[PDB]
Amino acid sequence: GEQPIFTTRAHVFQIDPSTKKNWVPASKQAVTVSYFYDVTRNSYRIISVDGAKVIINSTITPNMTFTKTSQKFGQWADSRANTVFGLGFSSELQLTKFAEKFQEVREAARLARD
């Protein structure tokens, strides 16, 4: 009931809630990050898992934005989890492809709820 849409690998970070200025690593090494379409819920999600620890389970809505802050790093806010996720990539192209997929998914999310 869940189809993978796009898969990449990145280092995952979350912004420190107190200072809002520091990145806390949410994974020791790089982890798999995937976009999924949830056929049961008619929604798109970003899912990253490190064994039995679910690091990212972000449902993507049209309002959410992925902001690139370097050639290899970008971030998006997830109000449901009350956090900001950052992803660090080993090549600039992986960041670009992730950002482009993110924008694609935002419109799919809005078109899917029409």
Add this chain to the structure above:
Amino acid sequence: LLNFDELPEPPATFCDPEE
């Protein structure tokens, strides 16, 4: 709020060079 008045710097490993 989760809003940023200023965007945060990326982690030092993933920053763009400056110079």
